[PDB]
Subunit: 474 residues, 3 copies
C-alpha cells in the first residue's frame, strides 16, 4: 500500500509531526481545540459587541447576570445590521472554512499514516508518548525493504529523512544567517533594532516556497529556469513584481491581521500581567535566536532541547547586568518611599479612621507598588557577580555567539547585543503586535531591491543530491 505515494516529503513530515503530537488522538484533539480557539475568540467578541448592553450593568434588588444578556432574536438583529461588523465576520468565517476543509483532509491523510505506524512499524498508539524519535527512526530505515516507499533511490538514509522533511527550513536558515532577509533596522531614539517575526517568516516561505508562482517547481525541485544566469535581470524583475504583489496583499490585510494579533496577545497574556506580571519579564529565545542558533539538519525537538538546557544560565546572565545609576536611584527611592509609607502605615495602624481620608489609600497603594517595583532593581547584596562564567554555560548549549563577546563579556553593549537573541517576553509580545504593520513595509522597500540578490543566491547555493532532489547548501 505504501508504494504509490509520490509525495515522500509530505509523508515524512506527517510521520514526524504525529510523534511530536504524542499520538493520533492528541493530534486530532489538539487540532479541534485550535479551531475552537479562533471560533471562541470571534464569538465572544461578537457576543460582547452586540448582545451585552453595558447599560443595566453600570446601573444607568440585586441584579443577575442573565438580565444583561439580550435574547437571541434581538442580538441577531443587531449583528446583521451593524454593517461594519458583518464585513469582518464574513472574512473571519471564510478563513475558518478553508482551515476546516484543510483539517478534514489532513485527518484523512493522517489516518493513513496511523496505519503505517501500527502495521508497518508494529508500534501501538499507546506507546507513542514514551517512544523517542530515535526508536521511530530505526524501525523506518531498517524495514525499508517491506513497505518499499522509495525504490527509485537505491536505499534510504538517515541524512535523507532529515533532508526530505527539512528541505525548506534549511533554506530559511541560510537566508537569515547570510543577512539576505530584511531584518536589521536603525531607529531614531532606539538605535539598532532586529525585527524578525512569524509574519516575515511565513511571508518568506510563501514568497519563495509555497504557491503556484514560487521558485520551487512541484515540491522538492526549484524550477530549472532559476538555474540559468542568462536572464538574471528578467527573473529579478519578475520576482520584484511578485514581491510587490505579496506586499500589496499584506497591506490590504493589515487591519484584519492586526485585530487577530491584538486579540491573541490579549486573550493569551493579558491575564498573566494581573496575576503574575513577572512572567512576562522572564526572557525567552526570540525567533531570530531560533534561526541564528539553529544547526543545519536539526529537527524541532533537537533545537528545543538546547534552548531548554540554556534557559536558566541565560536568566542569570541577563539578571547580573545592573546600572550604577538605576541601582543608586532605586536604593534612594525605596528609602524615601518606604520612609513615607512607614509613617503612613503607623498612622493607619494606630487609628484606622485615617483610612477614610481621601488620598491616603491611593498614596499607600502606589507607594507599595513603588517600593516593590523599585526594590526589584536592587540586587541581593551578597551575590557573586560572575557574568563571565554565565556566558560559558550558555555557549555550551546554544553553540553560537558573535566573536566580540568572548573577551568583553560584561560591557553594556554585549548585553544589548545578546538581548536580541534572548529577548524579553513582553518585548516578544509587542513585536508580534507590530508584525502585521511593519512586515509589508519591510518586504516592499527593503526586500524588493534585493530581489536580484536572492535570485543569485538560489542560483549559487542549491545542490542536487541524487535520489533526494534540489536541496539547500549546508
Amino acid at each position: 500500500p505504501w508504494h504509490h505515494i509520490e509525495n515522500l516529503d509530505l509523508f515524512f513530515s506527517r510521520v514526524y509531526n504525529l510523534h511530536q503530537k504524542n499520538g493520533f488522538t492528541c493530534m486530532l484533539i489538539g487540532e479541534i481545540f485550535e479551531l475552537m480557539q479562533f471560533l471562541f475568540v470571534v464569538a465572544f467578541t461578537t457576543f460582547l459587541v452586540s448582545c451585552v448592553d453595558y447599560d443595566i450593568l453600570f446601573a444607568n434588588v440585586k441584579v443577575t447576570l442573565p438580565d444583561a444578556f439580550l435574547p437571541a432574536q434581538v442580538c441577531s438583529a443587531r449583528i446583521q445590521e451593524n454593517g461594519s461588523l458583518i464585513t469582518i465576520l464574513v472574512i473571519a468565517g471564510v478563513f475558518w472554512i478553508h482551515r476546516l476543509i484543510k483539517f478534514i483532509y489532513n485527518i484523512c491523510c493522517y489516518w493513513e499514516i496511523h496505519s503505517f505506524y501500527l502495521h508497518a512499524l508494529r508500534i501501538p498508539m499507546s506507546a507513542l508518548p514514551y517512544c523517542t524519535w530515535q526508536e521511530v527512526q530505526a524501525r523506518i530505515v531498517q524495514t525499508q525493504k517491506e513497505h518499499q516507499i522509495c525504490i527509485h533511490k537505491r536505499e534510504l538514509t538517515e541524512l535523507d529523512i532529515y533532508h526530505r522533511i527539512l528541505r525548506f527550513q534549511n533554506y530559511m536558515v541560510a537566508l537569515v544567517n547570510k543577512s539576505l532577509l530584511p531584518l536589521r533596522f536603525r531607529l531614531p531614539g532606539l538605535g539598532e533594532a532586529v525585527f524578525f517575526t512569524r509574519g516575515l517568516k511565513y511571508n518568506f516561505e510563501l514568497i519563495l516556497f509555497w504557491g503556484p508562482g514560487s521558485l520551487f517547481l512541484n515540491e522538492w525541485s526549484l524550477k530549472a529556469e532559476y538555474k540559468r544566469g542568462g536572464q538574471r535581470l528578467e527573473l529579478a524583475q519578475r520576482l520584484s513584481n511578485r514581491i510587490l504583489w505579496i506586499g500589496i496583499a499584506n497591506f490590504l490585510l493589515c487591519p484584519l491581521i492586526l485585530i487577530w494579533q491584538i486579540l491573541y496577545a490579549f486573550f493569551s497574556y493579558a491575564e498573566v500581567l494581573k496575576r503574575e506580571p513577572g512572567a512576562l519579564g522572564a526572557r525567552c529565545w526570540s525567533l531570530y535566536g531560533r534561526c541564528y542558533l539553529r544547526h543545519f539538519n536539526e529537527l524541532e525537538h533537537e533545537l528545543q532541547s538546547r534552548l531548554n538546557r540554556g534557559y536558566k544560565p541565560a536568566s542569570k546572565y541577563m539578571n547580573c547586568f545592573l546600572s550604577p545609576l538605576l541601582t543608586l536611584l532605586a536604593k534612594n527611592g525605596a528609602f524615601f518611599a518606604g520612609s513615607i509609607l512607614a509613617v503612613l502605615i503607623a498612622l493607619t495602624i494606630y487609628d484606622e479612621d485615617v483610612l477614610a481620608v481621601e488620598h491616603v489609600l491611593t498614596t499607600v497603594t502606589l507607594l507599595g507598588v513603588t517600593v516593590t517595583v523599585c526594590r526589584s532593581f536592587i540586587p541581593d547584596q551578597h551575590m557573586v557577580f560572575c557574568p563571565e562564567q554565565l556566558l560559558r554555560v550558555i555557549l555550551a548549549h546554544i553553540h553560537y555567539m558573535p566573536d566580540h563577546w568572548q573577551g568583553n563579556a560584561h560591557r553594556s553593549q554585549t548585553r544589548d547585543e545578546f538581548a536580541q537573541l534572548f529577548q524579553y517576553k513582553a518585548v516578544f509580545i509587542l513585536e508580534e503586535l507590530l508584525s502585521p504593520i511593519v512586515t509589508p513595509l519591510i518586504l516592499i522597500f527593503c526586500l524588493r531591491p534585493r530581489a536580484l540578490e536572492i535570485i543569485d543566491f538560489f542560483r549559487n547555493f542549491t545542490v542536487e543530491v541524487v535520489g533526494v532532489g534540489d536541496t539547500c547548501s549546508f
Copy 2:
C-alpha cells in the same frame, strides 16, 4: 545495680529511644503532650457537642463569645443524659487510664535508664541532643566489664545490640518482602492497590509477637512447639482461631477506631488544606516503602536519613510525568477560562458596580481557582525532561527498586508502580482513614487461609544465635 535485669531486650530499646527523644525531659514532656492531645480532642469535641448551642451563634448589640457557652451545670446534665455520648466517653476514658498507668510505669523505668547514662557512661543529660548514636554505642560496648549486664554471653557485640533491639522488626521486614502478609489487592475501577497501614502492622505484631497467646514464649524465644513440624495442621488451626478472634475484635472496634482516625486526620491536616493545600500533594514515603526499602539490622534514624536524602529527587521524578491529554486540556482550559476572566476583570476594574451583580463574584472566584488549578498542571516550558537521571539519584539512596524499572524508566506503568512506594500525602491520609474498616477484612479472609503458610515460615526461617536467642533470618 545493672546486673539483675533479665530483660536486656527492653532495656536496650529504652536506651535507644531516649537518645531518639533527645534526652530525658523531652521524653517526659513529649509523652505528656501525647496524652494531652487525646484528652484535648475528646474534650473539645465533647464540649462542642454538648455545651455550645449554635442557636444564638447563627442568630436564630454585638454578641460576645461567652454567651454561646452554656454554664458548667447545664452542660454536665446534657452530657450525662446523652446516652449515646457517655458510652463513647467511657471507652475513651479507660484506654487513657491504661495508657496513663503504662506511662507512669515507663517513667519509673526510664529514670533508671537515666542513671545508667549519667553514671555508667558519664554522659550528662545536657549533651544528649548533640551526641550521635555512635558515641553512645562505643561507651556501652567498651565498658561492658563494669556494669556487667550480660555475663551469660561471653561478650557483647554491636551485632548483638542491633539484634536485641530489633528482634521483631526483622520479622516484620521478612513478612512484607516475601508477600506473606495480605497487602496486595485488585479493585474494580482502580486496578492494583497496595493497602498497608499502621493497623495491619500493629495487628501483625499483636497477633505474632505481643500477647500471652502469641508465637513468642517470653520475649525473645518463640515457643518450642512451633519448632516441630509434626503438628502443622493443628498449629495452623489454632492459629486460625487466633486470627479469627483478633479479626472479630477489630470488627467490634471498627466504629471507635474510625472515629479516632477521622478525628486525627481532621485535627492534624484539615487546616493545612485551607492555608497551603499543596503540602498534601507533596509526596512522602509510604509505610510499605519503609518496609520494602528497609535493610536488615537498621535502626530508625539510619533509615530516616536515607528517606531524607532521597526526598528531593523523588519530588522531581514524580513531577516530570505529565499527560499529553491533561497538558492539552489544561493549556486550552486555562486559555478559555482566563480569556473570560480577563474580560470580567476589565468590566470589574472600570466600574465596580458590576460587583453587585449576583453571579459575578462567584464566577470570578471559581475561575481564578480554575485558572490556578489548571495552570498548575502546565509545566515550565523550558524544563529538562530528564526522568532517567532522577531514578539514578533516588536509587542511590533508598537502594531498592524492581528490576523492570531500570530500562523503561519513563513508562506510565513505572510511575504507577513507584507511586506505591512514594505515595501522595493526601492518599496517605485517605488510607489511614480506611485502615480501621479494611484491616479486619484483610485479616479474616486473606490472612486466615495463610495461617498455615505463616506456621511454615516461622518454622523454616528462625535461627538461634548463641547468647542472643531466637532471631529472624536475614
Copy 3:
C-alpha cells in the same frame, strides 16, 4: 600638574573611591542624595511635629488631605515658638552646613581626580562601571614616569598603594584582633556579649588617627614623641585625659545621636517588618566579623566579595541548629492552634454571621499568626542535617575561625560563638540603636585604663617603610 600634591595618601583614597562609586556623576549624585536623606528626615519629622494637627485627622462630607496641613505662616510660628524644638533644629543645621561645605570642597577635589583618570590614564568616564580595579591599577603603576606624582621614592609599588590608602585601617585591624579595644562584655541574664558598632570604630579613629591631638603628626607619621619609652606614664596620662575628654563629648552628644540612630533605623527598616519581616531575620556579617575576618592590605571590594561568596552556606548553617524543646513545643502548639483554628474556620465558612461575634476575628488572626510563626520553627521533615559540611563551605571563604570549631561543629556553644561573627539583622539594628548610649561608657571605664597599653602598642608595632612612612605591623 600631578607633581605638587604633597598628600598622596588622600589622593589615592579618592582615586579608589571614584572607582568604587562607579564614575563621577554617580559620586556626585550619591553625595547629593545622602545630604538629602538627612534633610528629608529632619524636615518630615519637623513638619509632622508642627504643621499637622491630628485633631481633624481622627475626626475629633469626605475630608481631603490638604485640610490637615496647616498653612505655612501658622506652621512657622509654632516651630519658632517650641523652644524645645528649635534647639534641636539648630544643631541639626550646623552639622549639615559643615557637611555641605566639606562636600563642596570634595567636589572641587574630585574634579581634579576626574581629569587624572581622563587624561593621565586615558580611561573615559563611560567605561568606569565596567573597569575592574586591576585595570585601573596597571595603568597607574606603569605610567608612573609621566605624571611623576612620587619622585621622592625611587619607584611606585602595588604594595605601596595598598599601604598608602589603608594606613589607618590596618591599625584598626590590629587593635580588634589583639583585644586592645573594649569590645567584650559579660551581662547578667545574657552572658557573653560582643558590642562593636560604628560609633566605637568612628571614635577609635577619631581618638587615634584624626584630629589635631591624635597620635599621628601630619597624616602618615605618628609623632616622634610616641616612639620613646622614657615617658610612658606621662604619655599615658595625657592620652587618658584625651580619652576622658572624648568620652565627655560623647556623653554630651548622647541624646542627639540617639535621635539620629532611632530615626535612621525607623526610616530604613520599619517598613520591611510590615511587608517582609523575614528579611530582618536574615543574617549579615557584623562589624566585628568585618574586622576579625579581614586580611591585611585588603581593599573594601576584595573583602565584600568574600562575604558574598560565604553568605548562602552561612544562612543554611545557622538554620540547621534547632532545639529539641523548641521543635517539640512548636509541633505541639501548631497542632493545638491549628486544631482550634480549623473548627473556627469551618464555623466561619459555613455561615459568616459568626464573623460578627466580637472576639472571633482577633482569635483567628492571632492564631493564624501563631500557626505561621510556630510553623516556622518546624524544619523540613526530610532535610539532610549536615551542619559539618556547612562550616567547611564557610571557612573556605571568610578564612578565619576559632580553633575550637573544627571538631565540635554542632554544639550549641559553637553556634552561639559563630552568631557573634554572623549576627541577625534585627540584632544588628538593635545594637546600632544602643551604640550612642553604650559607646561613651565603653570608652571611659574600659578603654581609659588601657590608655597605657595602647601607648605600648603604638610603640612596639609600628615600622617605618622607606618612601612610604610610618605603617602598621602586619
